[PDB]
Write a protein that binds this DNA or RNA. Structure first.
Lengths: 109, 101, 98, 81, 109, 81, 101, 98
DNA sequence: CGATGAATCCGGTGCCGAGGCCGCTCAATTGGTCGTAGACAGCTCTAGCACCGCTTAAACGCACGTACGCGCTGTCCCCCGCGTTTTAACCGCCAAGGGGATTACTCCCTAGTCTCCAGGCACGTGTCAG
DNA sequence: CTGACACGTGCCTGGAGACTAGGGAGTAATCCCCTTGGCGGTTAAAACGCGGGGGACAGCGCGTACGTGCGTTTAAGCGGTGCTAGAGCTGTCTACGACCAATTGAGCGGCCTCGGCACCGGATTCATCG
């Protein structure tokens, strides 16, 4: 039940904390902005904090829906083939080759 | 007296008898072929006006439509393969009429 | 006269009619709307529609007939040439198959 | 080698915290982690490059809060309300 | 192998005839138009066809998604609880009560 | 004639036809029908009353293609394109 | 040059309280409570303006907005009281304003 | 001076500020915008805001403290009083947990 | 080793849509300013970027054991199949009148300019609330 | 705790009378297109009883694959410092959209014809359970 105990405090931490730390967000954001061009986009100090509060909540909602779908199948755990079903049920078209190229090959730094 | 419809022009663009088959058209083909143009010219101009208003301007001099077409080709994960060709065609057309003055 | 503005810019559709619907959504605060906005949009739309018509015509003759119908546009071509389909992702068109 | 390869900076801990943040499912298999990263990065790219284009169109070379607030709205994800 | 042939015929040959006939559709549309009002609203001759072409094509997508979910759940048939998952994952929750008065109390046309 | 109450005007065979138009699942249980009826009527009630209100706002009494088109557009269902 | 916002006016709502006290607030919730107003205003104004173009008119007042509120209530399937009380309050406010002519 | 807009319709928020927002989004086929629409819109918004604040304040005290926080807005009055929630659409309030 | 219901293909038919005319009546040019908007060179002061040293939370990898996903099998019940009976689309025809659509007109309520003063915006300040 | 918001103050420009032109919305008048409605005669489709079978739910066995505790890194993270790209406001000259005559042909609305597709009737692949 350690998972249950940690999930008890996870919401209370969520009221003030973030899932991925600030510097690993500043990088990632800067690296992606630097693509599709050849210039340093020179972000501000509040755009990153505005982006985080949207993306993290969006994916919290997505995984909540996916876990709800997984429970319905009388399966306790969560599998990847549950996400694709939710994504295609929301008509959210995606590209797989581009996503694989983005995730696999980069340097960030 | 006069109306707004593209039936005559829609039934004209494609050069007939490419091999000997002039493009026919049903009654319900016109409805979809006009609705596509209506929807495109509505959404693209909406996203090209909400960006000129963001900049703080008053004129849409086709430089506020290039970055609307690019936005609409990036939002749909559509690779620039068939967006750069359309952009080049539009830029070539713009100069054609402009230079004639 | 340059009444052949379609010939002036090398287009087919009349730019004025496209400007009539361009001006319908300007949300005020903008106005103006220089006439160079219509030519670019008209050229792009003309290329899109010409490609769609050419493909649908090429692929309709396999079933036969000399007509283009919603069934020959929704299925057959748009599910094959999805590049021009995704840009208007909400197809939901008409009496057609899938 | 290390080269801080992209996507791993969203470590397994972040995915586990996101999954356990809700209280319905307390387990996750090995297929979930490689999918979460690719689900995130596409959305982040499609919501960042739009704001970059909007920032470049108005002169300038730096991104401001209004640009990203417009990009989030355009990316079909609503904000505080 | 009778349902397979029935589906093969239905998918191709019947691309024009709708699932529900015109007269019952007109009767239900007219009955629902006078709900929550005090005047016989009349109608046109081409609006009903547009309403049909909208509603039926809207329901077909939902049923395709629900059937895909049911197949993904390692099952062969289809159950009502499959539709609820798609309804929740796509938002727009229905007031359970209204649908009941609509299907049950409403009785005319 | 004996039973005229709403819902069954959408025939029992209509559900079979619309579920068989897609080649994925060839069977259905007893409880599928009421969910279909409730969903369809819940959508149609809003989609028709929006058009009725838009018609009555501009004077007139008879609904017209423009009003139903506007109602469909506002009901988050996007027609031919 | 000044900036125009509802930061003070949001703190100006009903706070005098004898039976419950608590006229409190904070600066963290100011942003969300002032974005709520803008969101509602834009959302209902868009629908009112769209509904106006049907009639061929070019004027908005006490009409198109009321029908927009009714439409945004029907689309939500809210409880009848939520929209009924709001529209009755709006009618009362407009009558109070127009009493003095 | 009638600039005492608060006592004009008994409201609090200044109708003018809402009116500029109204005039921001208007396709270039309307203009006009009679001044009696702003009063209606401002009254509706004022009632909504007063009700949500009154509802959230009482519960934001039981948890402790005497202020109002984004989590203390998302919880209860948005989750309990969903009537003033469904009207806007999504919630996505802030760092307010679940 | 044949051979059911049919896997699709050939041979026409006539019944109304799509394509070729056929003048005409406004919609797209064409010239002619001109007064606001967009451009653009210069500048002044702000915040974004880059690096150092210390400390401690947090992500991280390994050993081990149990919770849980998956394949097997008996079952029994509930969905489909098929003939048959009941209903009710639906197409041809003739009324009947509601209400869409155009015109005259005239008076109200928005648009715009001229003048003023007090409400709202930008600093000190302390005392409790996270 | 320590710093942040509610209290207090000084100022200025934007919200207000106010008076006027000038056009758009309300409204009576008029006719003719189009919605609704009743009859009926074939005739297809939905509703219904019955039988056999396959598909959902449920136990058991199995084994590999997550969760957990523990020692070990390791970059998040603070506060400070300095350096400079670029946001931001201002002053000047002008190109190019706007509104107004005057002219003229191109596409909208009707008519006329002739084939395109819906339709049926006939000849047969694959197959198949004896």
């Amino acid at each position: 039940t350690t998972a249950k105990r940690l999930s008890k405090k996870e919401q209370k931490l969520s009221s003030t904390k973030t899932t991925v730390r600030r510097a690993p967000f500043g990088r990632i954001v800067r690296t992606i902005a630097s693509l599709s061009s050849a210039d340093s986009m020179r972000f501000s100090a509040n755009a990153v904090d505005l982006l985080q509060q949207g993306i993290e909540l969006y994916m919290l909602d997505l995984m909540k829906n996916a876990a709800l779908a997984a429970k319905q199948a009388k399966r306790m755990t969560l599998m990847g083939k549950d996400i694709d079903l939710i994504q295609t049920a929301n008509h959210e078209m995606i590209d797989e080759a581009h996503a694989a190229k983005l995730a696999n090959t980069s340097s960030a730094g | 007296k006069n109306y707004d419809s593209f039936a005559t022009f829609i039934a004209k663009l494609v050069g007939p008898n490419g091999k000997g088959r002039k493009p026919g058209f049903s009654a319900k083909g016109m409805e979809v072929l006009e609705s596509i143009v209506k929807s495109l010219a509505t959404e693209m101009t909406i996203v090209a006006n909400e960006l000129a208003k963001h900049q703080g301007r008053q004129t849409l001099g086709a430089g506020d439509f290039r970055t609307a077409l690019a936005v609409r080709g990036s939002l749909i994960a559509r690779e620039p393969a068939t967006v750069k060709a359309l952009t080049e065609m539009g830029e070539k057309a713009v100069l054609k009429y402009q230079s004639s003055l | 006269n340059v009444k052949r503005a379609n010939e002036r810019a090398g287009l087919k559709l009349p730019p004025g009619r496209i400007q009539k619907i361009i001006k319908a959504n300007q949300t005020t605060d903008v106005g103006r709307s220089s006439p160079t906005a219509s030519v670019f949009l008209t050229a792009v739309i003309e290329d899109i529609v010409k490609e769609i018509i050419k493909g649908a015509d090429k692929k309709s003759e396999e079933r036969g007939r000399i007509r283009i119908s919603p069934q020959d546009i929704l299925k057959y071509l748009t599910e094959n040439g999805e590049a021009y389909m995704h840009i208007l992702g909400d197809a939901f068109v008409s009496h057609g198959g899938v | 080698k290390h080269i801080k390869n992209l996507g791993e900076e969203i470590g397994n801990s972040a995915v586990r915290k996101t999954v356990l943040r809700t209280g319905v499912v307390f387990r996750l298999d090995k297929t979930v982690r490689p999918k979460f990263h690719k689900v995130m990065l596409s959305k982040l790219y499609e919501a960042v490059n739009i704001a970059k284009l909007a920032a470049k169109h108005s002169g300038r070379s730096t991104i401001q809060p209004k640009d990203v607030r417009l990009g989030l709205k355009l990316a079909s994800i609503k904000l505080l309300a």
